[PDB]
Amino acid sequence: DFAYFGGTSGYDEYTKKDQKSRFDYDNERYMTRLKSQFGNSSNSINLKEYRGLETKQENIKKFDDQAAISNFDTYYNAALKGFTLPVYGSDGKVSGLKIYEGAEIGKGPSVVDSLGRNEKAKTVGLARTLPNEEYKTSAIQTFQTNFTIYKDYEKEIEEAEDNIKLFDSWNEQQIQSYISAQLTQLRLNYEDEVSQIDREISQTQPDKTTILSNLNQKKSKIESEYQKELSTISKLNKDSLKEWQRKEIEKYNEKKKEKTFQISESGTMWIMDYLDENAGKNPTKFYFGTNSHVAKGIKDGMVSFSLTRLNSEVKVGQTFKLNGHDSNFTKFTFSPINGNKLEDAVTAIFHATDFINENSSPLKLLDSEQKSKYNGAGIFADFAIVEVDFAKLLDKGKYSYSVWSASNDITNQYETEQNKLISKITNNYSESDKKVKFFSDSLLNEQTYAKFDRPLDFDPKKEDELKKYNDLDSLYIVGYPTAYKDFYLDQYEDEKQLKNKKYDFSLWINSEYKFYNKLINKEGSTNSFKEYETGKGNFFSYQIGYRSFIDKPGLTDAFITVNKVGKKLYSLKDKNKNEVKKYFNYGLEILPRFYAPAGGASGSSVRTKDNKLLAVYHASNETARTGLAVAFRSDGYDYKNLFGDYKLGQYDLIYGGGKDQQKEKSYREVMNKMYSGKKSALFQNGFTDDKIPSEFKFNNGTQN
Amino acid sequence: RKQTITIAGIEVEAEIEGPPGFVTHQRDKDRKISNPTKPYQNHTVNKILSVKVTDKLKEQVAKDALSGGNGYDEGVGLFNNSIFNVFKEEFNSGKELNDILSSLESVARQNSGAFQNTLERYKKMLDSNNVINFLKSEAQKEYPKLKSKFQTKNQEYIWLIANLDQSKFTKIASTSEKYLEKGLTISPRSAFINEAGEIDSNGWGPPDEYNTVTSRLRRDNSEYRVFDYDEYYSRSSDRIANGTYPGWVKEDVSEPYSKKYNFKASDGIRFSKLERINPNPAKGKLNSGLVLDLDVSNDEAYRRSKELIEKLQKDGEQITSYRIKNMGEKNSDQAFKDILGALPKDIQQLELFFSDKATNTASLIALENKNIKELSLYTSGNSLKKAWSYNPLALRNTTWINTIDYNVSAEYSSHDKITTRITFNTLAFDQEDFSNGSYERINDGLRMVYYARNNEPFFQGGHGPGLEPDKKLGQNSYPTGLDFSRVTGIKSLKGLRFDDDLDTSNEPRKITELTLYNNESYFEISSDELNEANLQHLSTGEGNPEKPKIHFSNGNNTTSIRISGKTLLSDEGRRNLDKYFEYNESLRNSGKQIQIPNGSDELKKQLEGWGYK
8 A cells, every 4th residue: 555655654745745746756766666777878968057957947857867767858958959859769667656446456457348427428438439440451461561671670780699699599499399299209109119110200300300490590691580489388389480571571462462361450439520511400421530540541452441339328337248249339331332442431531740830830850960860750649530421331332331239230120211320320429419529728727737636535424525526537438449458358258258359349448447347226226336436537647757747647748758659650651642751749648547458449539527528549558557648739838948949839630720730730721621611510600710719719818 | 665676677676765755844834935835856756775786687787888778878888889880880891901091080080089089988908908819809810910010009909999809898897886786877878998808987877767867857847837848858049049848839929919009020029829739638727828028128118018018917818928038138227126016916937038248137026926837037148157146035936946948068159149047156135135134034035045945956056956955955055155235234144044943954054155235445344243153154165275255346445344333352253354354355465454443452453444535
């Protein structure tokens, strides 16, 4: 419980501390788990020049900590000017404080099949965050050509010592492949005192393979590592992989020409809008919020598109089976006919790329010297908006639809007439009143943050449940991760767990792991949890590594903190036959408390209490037990020249018209050129700049 | 006594006894805790205490294990079985000795689990051990040379089994002779040859007049079931789902009723007629029955079920079976107490098909006159999940709960729907069973299962009978779980009895698992821990590696056991406090105690009872 605080007396003073003095306690602990490793060693500044470390008296950090807390931008001061963006490895994350649950900390990522309250489902993860979505391409290889080019730089950007001493040393799985096979033949030789040893010919398994397993050693010109996949004490000891990657890529590029296997891009969306031709009566053309690495799965070679969603009929407190196993989900799969293309009906319309790039507002002109390497690369936030036109997906001359439930085909027993079938697909979002809104308040202003600023503990018996009820919530019954890392399934729930990875998903949430099979409102039962406990969302994460704004737990600026994730910066292929372009992660971002859904659930809307869209989740870290979400709106932030000419930037990528925003790079002003003079469910007066509601303006309106 | 019986055609002298009667007590009737209409009995047939084995009998029992005899295990005897017959037919072909290669191919291709299953029955002899040559026919001249000339071990010892002489095996092994003195003959499917050239087994069967399992299932299918049949077999999953029975034929009659009561064929309401194919004039009890099928996964059938069940009653149309299908499949909190309470006070059959994604058996049917020897508790999911409960008081005036129609095996495909009776290892009491601080209704409901109806198969849980289910109630299985999650006042085994009022004639029950209601992060308990009943929560037995379990309805119990009141703990007060930390995971992890601010701190480990989180 209190050992991280030095006991119950040391926890009591942490409860009474403010967020600045709470941070200084956690950061002197985070930095010693971190500096157990020797950290970043890139270009560095001399013993002077801590005037930047005193310029933090306006906004607080510490400069030599910041050089290692992660790959942060720090400072560059030889002409008092420039930025250093790092690439020399990656840095790990945890936090032993956002939890206090007192048992199973490794289950700090959310519950998985259960609904806490109506604002989570029957509002958010049902009807609205409707589709777990799949795009099927009928190929495999574009992951493996690039991963084998990466494996080739891993092979041969290497020293002549290790060109032997990483291969010929780590050959022990070939030795195990012999001595295990030998132990079969050793035992088979036990009962042969008279019977002829025909088996000596099968004891060529050492000898005729010894020459092959030694010729594969000698040359080592480009084959610079062992041909071996995995090893354990018993299982998963298979070894067969090829070498010389441009010959392996020649095999991949011919396997890419056979339409044998199929692979899926899969992610999550929410319904945000519809184009309004018919006085709101019966809409057919819908817009879905998602993230950009999910929306790039929309490719011209696509064989099918699908939407699986929780039906509106469902009730709170229930716990579901997996997505392919529960009849409370429905799935709608669409496929092309007569050579019609699936992109003729499903389109990525907005991509949130380079949305600051009016003159003087950018950040790339601030890079010191690594702009030699990162030439042409832009900035983005991982958010995209996809159009689906059901009036040309339910057109039987051009596409065939199929309706599925619990892995039955239900197409000929489901709804058939188009306006009712679009309403059964979209959980009737047209005739609902709980349509989406966007969070207009600045999360950086102190009176806004204080609405989410939870107490660590409270007296539930005292009258100040008022002011704990009245906290704003983050809601994310959104995202469907693949069911492979779903730990709530019992070892003996075999049928759910059998097809674990293929075709199957979970309804991940933002809640205590304690709810799982426990919220069921059976007749004649009593509720086992207090109404304050299930009746809320959760909050921001006390993770140190991802945080930029120090007195604001779980607020960050992505470019100063998280400019890149994984090994390689993000590429997006542009249309109109342009090239690929590379982009750094940028914008205001949020760290959700109980949310590391592995292997899917990118594209998941963070919301608050009255169905206001707040952020878009895109990256997970299940060792941090948290992950990262794009805020749609930023008030900007000013660093008082600490970061030179740099600023967080003020923008809105749904409404536009923010002080640093490119004035052609938001949902409204994209939709204005496509549908000039028409209405929308978000834009009922039209897309024109004079019809922004005064809540979403900046600077002349300082309250939002 | 001391009669003769036939066991292998051969007439044999044997000591035979009648099965002891189930002794009902007059307190089992006056508490309405015995069976409501007729006392059940499990051992329907006599016992064999001893059999006079003779040379003539044990050589008949030998020849049956070689041939298969003429019973059910015909065609699986040691020298008459599917693998042995496929090998002998190839040796009977005109080809040269190296056609041994094609017999080995008939064990690698598809049959790899039939060989290496039949092989074992010879293998203890087949591994030479300085004996095999004496049991090898005329091939005794070929063997000592040809032994050197085989390419694989299997190609060799295939040539032993295909050349063994059946005439050498007229000897019975020492253990299988003592089972024959108990009157159980070697099963021809279980027979093997041991090292010494003698017949032994891993399985022995009685004559069919002395089988306890099939005679019980025959008696139950032929007289407890409505829609009875003369066989002993359980019904198939397709028979259970469609509602069909051996010797009965089903007709859909839904059209007149759909026209009268205004429903579509899509509305999930059906009526079907069953009639017996050969009718039975000799007693007027039942030859045909109207059956009502309600698919309550539909929302018209659920909306109308209570209305329809009452319109059929005031119109005076009589239903022999109500079938309620997919209970809890769409919505797991879906209530049925209003629907089950609208059904007649007197019912022939009720089939309830519960969904295992709900497992919501909370509806209660006690305050009735009769279920006329039928309640079927069914699912089309996992029926041996630990979260399956019944209230034992909900069955008070049900004459027979269906315990046949058990259809669980590893050999079914995954990903198809199979229907079976539920296995229950839990007793779960409801809130209305504990009104006045009284423990009376629970001790009645608890002894119903554990002793007053224990000789019946349903009240035995998932393990079934002992050696004498009607006499030694103690040696039999019982549901070893207790759930109190619905009944919020219970904190302990205080006031609960686990023996029959008697003692010298029976074992006392022991529970393996205890679920309790809890509402807060602390388990609040008075100083009743001196007198929580202690040794009664101890698994099946004392020496086991795995300890028994305590659970709570919340799982948030990572704050302390809060001990309230001024009274000091005794020696059993110490022992009871240990068990809540040991047997409950989320308490075991830190051992935290709270003493609220009165008394001495007699305990030396606790917090001052803050109540803040």
